[PDB]
């Protein structure tokens, strides 16, 4: 009830406010399909990949549970990025506590999805585990020690896969708890709305207005998920993970899961190890800085044309980075990727805050 029924809600929130519930649904979907996959999966490097093919070939409906889990992960990120985008555009980040927990949630889901991708032990699994864990080797003096500690040896091996199964199993439940805190902080203020103006003078009950909208949204999410699972289950996946892990050979066109491509492009744009890892980390952590960079006298971008243009430039730029992350490190992609990487940080750190100040002067305040 104090999470539904009589909860006061703005009368004017749009469908962009539907992603919070879709994220909750994605998480429950992942936990359910995941638990059922865990009932058949074995984490020994000699049997991991085989146990997954066993799930898809001989377990009753094992294939639909497996592909719902795989594509569910993709739907999770689509929803995450839409959710974060909504927050940025409408200035929802001014709810500092809710927003910062939000940042933690994004990072935890990324870590969870990374480890999950490692479980089937395919080629992408093994090299992703290799590359991502090695990000820690960028830490001075103790980096290498930390990596080997995480691996449980001098290289990714048996000990690594077994602990990744354990971490992947439990983290989602921690995410669920953190999500509940995310919501407890939000309830203290109530939701933001498209105009960015307090909606206390025009609130409506959550039920039936948004309970029905949430259900409609849930149905559409399920339609999208099942269109992928039933008509194109491998569309968003990588063919290379259908090949067992081979520690002596890295595929020549290896690339990250689609939802990690933009960050990959940013890291690849910097011909310095520490520099790339720092840029990678900052590409996500900069989210925690957004509230401090807010210069506008108005909360939402609804009434700010300049900010809007820059916002869409930032989206187009992330799309640019996503595209580049999927191309080989060759001309002209190298330069485009570097320009796109620079623009990303330039937009967030300089252009948007500056546009806010310009807009303020234009309105004489």
């Amino acid at each position: 009830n104090n999470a539904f029924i009589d909860l006061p809600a703005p009368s004017n929130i749009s469908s962009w406010w539907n992603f919070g519930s879709l994220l909750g649904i994605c998480l429950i979907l992942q936990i359910l399909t995941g638990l059922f996959l865990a009932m058949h999966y074995t984490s020994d490097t000699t049997t991991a990949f085989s146990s997954v093919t066993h799930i898809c070939r001989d377990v009753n409906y094992g294939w639909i549970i497996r592909y719902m889990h795989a594509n569910g992960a993709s739907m999770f990120f689509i929803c995450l990025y839409m959710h974060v985008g909504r927050g940025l555009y409408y200035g929802s980040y001014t709810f500092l506590e809710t927003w910062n927990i939000g940042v933690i949630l994004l990072l935890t889901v990324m870590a969870t999805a990374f480890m999950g991708y490692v479980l089937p032990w395919g080629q992408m699994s093994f090299w992703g585990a290799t590359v991502i864990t090695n990000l820690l080797s960028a830490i001075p003096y103790i980096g290498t020690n930390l990596v080997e500690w995480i691996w449980g040896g001098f290289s990714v091996d048996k000990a690594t896969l077994t602990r990744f199964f354990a971490f992947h199993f439990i983290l989602p439940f921690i995410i669920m708890a953190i999500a509940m805190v995310h919501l407890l902080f939000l309830h203290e203020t109530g939701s933001n709305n498209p105009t960015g103006i307090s909606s206390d003078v025009d609130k409506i009950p959550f039920h039936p207005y948004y309970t029905i909208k949430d259900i409609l949204g849930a149905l559409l999410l399920i339609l999208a998920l099942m269109l992928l699972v039933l008509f194109a289950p491998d569309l968003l996946g990588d063919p290379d993970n259908y090949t067992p892990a081979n520690p002596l050979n890295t595929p020549p066109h290896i690339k990250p899961e689609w939802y990690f491509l933009f960050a990959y492009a940013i890291l690849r744009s910097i011909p310095n190890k520490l520099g790339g890892v720092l840029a990678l980390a900052f590409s996500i952590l900069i989210l925690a800085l957004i509230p401090l960079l807010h210069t506008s006298k108005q909360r939402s971008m609804m009434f700010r044309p300049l900010s809007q243009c820059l916002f869409w430039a930032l989206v187009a730029d992330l799309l640019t980075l996503t595209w580049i992350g999927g191309q080989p490190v060759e001309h002209p992609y190298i330069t485009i990727g570097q320009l796109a990487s620079v623009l990303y940080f330039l937009l967030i750190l300089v252009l948007m805050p500056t546009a806010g100040t310009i807009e303020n002067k234009l309105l004489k305040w």
Partner: protein, 441 residues
């Protein structure tokens, strides 16, 4: 005697009719005083947007002087014999009545006849009353109860004559002309639309002769093109919320469409309304009151007061309740109230219905106590039912009601039906219409 034999001892109401259509009805007793008056089928339901408020304006002029008794002459005559002259207008009926010594019945009938037929309507008086009415409109604005009930009619009967207030909009008050009034009068104040009623120490034959003597000139024709008939009024499930956080308490009125005067179902509905009852902070019963709504409200301090009602009009009506409460108690009050309507629709018990029946029996008889309440019952009944319904009949109708009848009748008017809702004051907590609608099932 038993309550049963006492019922059969009430003198039967005598009814006669003049050539011009005027009905004359009376109930004789041995009281040395009486009440006699004229009830008319005229009210704002008969008015259009152009002349809405005409009837109320006329009420203001009715006692200000007649052609035979100009100015305060009518007034002096009423007062000098120690009589009392009063009047009232509703959306369907208008009444002018006098309380006087029984021996003064002849002069009383003459004065009423004079009032109803020879009203002066002096232009200067009309201008004075214009200001009086405007001031009364301002005063009425301070009565949250009157405001909420006018709002309930405005929304429940939106787009129909019943949506109109009796007093009319202020702009009509500023513009109504004598022409408008004389016109209204020639059209509505006809003998076939009136009932001369009287109760007290007098005989029907005397009243009838006095009526023949003083009311025969009253028109009983009109014509054919100008015979104001009533069209049914559509009821609309809707809500009107006038938020004013400056007011200390919120007033809420909610109702479903009722059946209308003539319907037999009104008795069972009255029984059901008696079960839920009424309440206010000064009631001594508190936590022990029989009505669940009343005891819950009293023990939990949910409201200052509440009252169920069954407002009847020709072919429709407002069946529901009104409550006054603190801004934080509206949802709770609505929750308990709707829960009680649903409990009656699905689970009314024989014992609570018997209580309801006994409450209704007591209300009926205790209401007809005195010549004025009786005279009003005669006048109104003749206009609405076309006859005076005797107590023995009311008892028979009440007797026929049991738990089964209450569940079925309540289900017919309350269950899964769209209500009309009116709120005024600090109503931020008044439930959304969808939530109220879902509460109906």
């Amino acid at each position: 005697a038993t309550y049963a034999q006492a019922l059969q001892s009430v003198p039967e109401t005598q009814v006669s009719q003049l050539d011009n259509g005027l009905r004359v009805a009376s109930e004789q007793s041995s009281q040395p005083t009486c009440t006699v008056g004229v009830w008319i089928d005229a009210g704002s339901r008969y008015e259009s947007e152009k002349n809405n408020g005409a009837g109320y304006f006329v009420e203001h002029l009715a006692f200000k002087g007649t052609k035979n008794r100009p100015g305060n002459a009518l007034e002096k005559e009423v007062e000098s014999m120690g009589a009392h002259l009063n009047a009232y207008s509703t959306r369907e009926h208008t009444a002018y009545y006098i309380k006087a010594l029984s021996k003064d019945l002849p002069k009383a009938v003459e004065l009423l006849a004079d009032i109803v037929q020879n009203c002066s309507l002096e232009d200067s008086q009309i201008e004075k009353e214009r200001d009086v009415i405007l001031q009364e409109l301002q005063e009425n604005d301070t009565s949250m109860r009157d405001v909420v009930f006018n709002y309930l009619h405005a929304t429940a009967f939106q787009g129909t004559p019943l949506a109109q207030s009796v007093e009319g909009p202020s702009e009509n008050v500023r513009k109504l002309s004598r022409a408008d009034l004389t016109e209204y009068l020639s059209r509505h104040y006809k003998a076939p639309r009136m009932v001369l009623a009287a109760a007290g120490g007098l005989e029907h034959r005397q009243l009838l002769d006095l009526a023949q003597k003083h009311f025969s000139g009253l028109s009983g024709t009109y014509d054919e093109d100008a015979v104001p008939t009533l069209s049914p009024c559509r009821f609309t499930g809707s809500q009107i919320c006038h938020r004013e956080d400056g007011l200390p308490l919120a007033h809420v009125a909610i109702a479903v469409e009722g059946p209308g005067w003539a319907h037999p179902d009104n008795v069972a509905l009255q029984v059901a309304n008696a079960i839920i009852g009424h309440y206010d902070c000064t009631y001594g019963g508190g936590a022990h009151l029989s009505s669940p709504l009343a005891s819950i409200a009293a023990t939990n301090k949910l409201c200052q007061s509440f009252q169920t009602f069954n407002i009847c009009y020709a072919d429709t009506g407002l069946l529901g309740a009104h409550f006054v409460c603190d801004h934080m108690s509206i949802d709770d009050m609505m929750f308990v109230l709707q829960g009680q309507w649903m409990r009656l629709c699905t689970s009314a018990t024989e014992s609570e219905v018997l209580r309801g029946k006994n409450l209704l029996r007591n209300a009926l008889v205790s209401h007809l106590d005195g010549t004025t309440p009786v005279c009003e019952d005669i006048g109104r009944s003749l206009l609405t039912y076309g006859r005076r319904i005797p107590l023995a009949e009311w008892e028979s109708r009440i007797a026929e009601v049991d738990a089964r009848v209450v569940r079925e009748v309540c289900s017919k008017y309350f269950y899964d039906q769209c209500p009309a809702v009116a709120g005024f004051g600090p109503i931020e907590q008044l439930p959304d219409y969808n939530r109220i609608r879902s509460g109906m099932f």
